[PDB]
Amino acid sequence: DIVLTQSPASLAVSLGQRATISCRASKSVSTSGYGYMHWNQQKPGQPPRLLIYLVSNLESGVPARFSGSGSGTDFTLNIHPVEEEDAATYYCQHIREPLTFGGGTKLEIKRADAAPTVSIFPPSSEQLTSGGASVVCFLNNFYPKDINVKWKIDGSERQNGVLNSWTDQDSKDSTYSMSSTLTLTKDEYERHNSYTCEATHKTSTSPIVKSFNRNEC
Amino acid sequence: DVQLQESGPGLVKPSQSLSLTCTVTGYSISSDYAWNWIRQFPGNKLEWMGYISYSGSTSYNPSLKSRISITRDTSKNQFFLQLSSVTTEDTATYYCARGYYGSSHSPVWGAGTTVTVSSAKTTPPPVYPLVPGSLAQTNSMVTLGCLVKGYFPEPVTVTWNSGSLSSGVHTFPAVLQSDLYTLSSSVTVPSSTWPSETVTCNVAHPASSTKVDKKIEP
């Protein structure tokens, strides 16, 4: 029942910044024998790695930047020049059995605005000929992630039947990419003409529009 | 060279028994540290399940006690996990580690292996190309895509032109309207090369031992 609630949960910063977090238990874990602590990290797509141990003992990895502190009950991880690739999720764990973990903090760096490069895609032929017809719409390399999107079948708005999905930020160019996929049936599809997907971002008052009619059949 | 990588199934029917092995190389089990198991639910969740001391002694998480068990085989430097009475919350990624016995000091985490528990059969995925259609893109740099829709369960590996050229590729995380996963991948390739140089979509659904490449054209 020994907790380790960690805070904050998320976090937006820029190249270089005092990224210092805390993990507070409901008992001691630093001074009571061999049990101390540790802060691991993990890039979305790989299991955690070692960074700290024994509460404040940097690993052979790449210390100096990251630093462990506090002991007994409340501890604190600290990295000063928030390196770019540092983006990841940070965790804390103790050892007084059953070894429990702290919530975890998502760390996403801030960068300059960027309008999404929208591109629309008509249903694949192989698909249409299967009663299924699904229109897709890509929004690449934009930031901030905040962004509303909407489809207008023959002008009207389409609510249900769409599945959106975002990619997390990358090291290369700290940006986001989202993908929208309005699905429907072969029938109703051919029942209409134009297919539009409008996006609203803070990068442009006026909504980014890309669409198409079936002028090629 | 302490290499430890877990292996087991990937999809299992609930209220059954899941049991995966973790093999370690470079070091010997009967030599130090505790060898535990840990699972991670969709973000914000990590849970220590239990361990096995080089001594051969074991300590389980009170939560999964009476439903778990950890054995080993000194002769093959590999330790195992047995979870019975599996439901749905038991769907997470599974990692094994060398969390130093006694308390903690220098851990070593496996790669991982996901395990989803469900009734859903195991269906493959049909891939569909995402060609453009002569615009102002047919002058600049064209963006092509590829759509994987309706397979079960995760994961799914997509690449572009068998790995050849990954610069400028965004593969989006799978979702589900019913009990089927759909996912998409995009690739922005230079306009002056599209038509001529062919582009091929690559997708493999291990679970169904599926493999599919899909060329793309106007």
Contact residues on chain B for A186, CB-CB shorter than 8 A: none
| Cα–Cα dist B178/B116, whole Å | 16
The CATH code of the domain at A6-110 is 2.60.40.10
Out of A34, A48, A216, the one facing B102 most closely (by C-beta) is A34
- Strand order through the sheet with B142-151: B127-130, B142-151, B181-189, B169-175
The answer to whether A6-110 and A111-214 have equal CATH topology is yes
Cα nearest neighbour of B217 on chain A: A124
Which residues numbered 49-78 in A keep a CB inside 8 Å of some CB on B?
49-50, 53-54
Chain B residue with Cα closest to A92: B46
User: In this complex, how many residue pairs, one in chain A and one in chain B, have their CB atoms less than 8 Å apart?
Assistant: 117
Q: What is the spatial distance between Cα A142 and Cα A119, in angstroms, rounded to a whole number?
A: 13
CB pair distance less than 8 Å for A48 and B173: no
3-state secondary structure of A88: strand
Q: Residue A118's closest CA among A98, A138, A99, A100?
A: A138
* Tokens standing for residue A189: 């599809």
| Contact call for residues A36 and B103 (beta carbons, < 8 A) | yes
Best residue in B68, B130, B138 for a mutation probing chain A (most A CBs within 10 Å): B130
Note whether B170 contacts A: Cβ–Cβ < 8 A.
Answer: yes
Looking at residue B178, the DSSP 8-state letter turns out to be S
On whether the CB atoms of residues B6 and B96 are closer than 8 A, the answer is yes
What is the Cα–Cα distance from B74 to A21, expressed in whole angstroms? 41
Domains of chain B: 1-119 (2.60.40.10), 120-218 (2.60.40.10)
Contacts of B173 (CB under 8 A, 6+ apart): A165, A166, A167, B183
Alpha carbon distance B217, B129 (integer Å):
8
The two tokens of residue A162 are 């769409």
Q: Which residues of chain A are within 8 Å of residue B111 when distances are taken between CB atoms?
A: 47
Q: Is B104 on the interface with A (CB under 8 A)?
A: yes
Contact between A142 and B136 under an 8 Å Cβ cutoff? The reply is: no
Q: How far is CA B111 from the centre of its chain?
A: 9
> A196 CA to chain B: closest CA distance, Å?
15
| Interface touch B46/A119, C-beta < 8 Å | no
- Closest partner residue to A126 (CB to CB) among B128, B132, B183 is B128
Residue B175 and residue B151 in contact, taking contact as beta carbons nearer than 8 Å: no
What are the residue ranges of helices labelled H in A63-212? 125-128, 186-190
Alpha carbons within 13 angstroms on the beta-carbon side of residue A152 total 15
- Among B4, B217, B15, B10, which Cα is nearest to A125's? B217
Which of B133, B174, B175 lies at the smallest CB-CB distance from A122? B133
DSSP conformation class of A181: E
Handedness of CA B35, B36, B40, B46 (dihedral sign): negative
Q: Is A190 helix (H, G, I), strand (E, B) or coil?
A: helix
Phi, psi angle pair for B179, to nearest 5°: -115, 45
Could A54 and B133 be called an inter-chain contact, meaning their C-beta atoms sit closer than 8 Å?
Answer: no
* HEC assignment per residue over A1-34: CCCCCEECCCCEECCCCCEEEEEECCCCCCCCCC
Question: Which chain A positions have a beta carbon within 8 Å of B102's beta carbon?
Answer: 34
Widest Cα–Cα separation across chain B: 69
Resolution value in angstroms: 3.0
Angle, alpha carbons A87-B201-A121 (nearest 5°): 85
Q: Read off the DSSP letter of residue A169.
A: P
Class of domain A111-214: mainly beta
Q: Does B63 touch chain A (CB under 8 A)?
A: yes
Domain boundaries along the sequence of chain A: 6-110, 111-214
3-class state of residue A187 by DSSP: helix
Chain B residues close to A107, C-beta within 8 Å = none
Rounded CA gap, A176 and A87, in Å?
A: 13
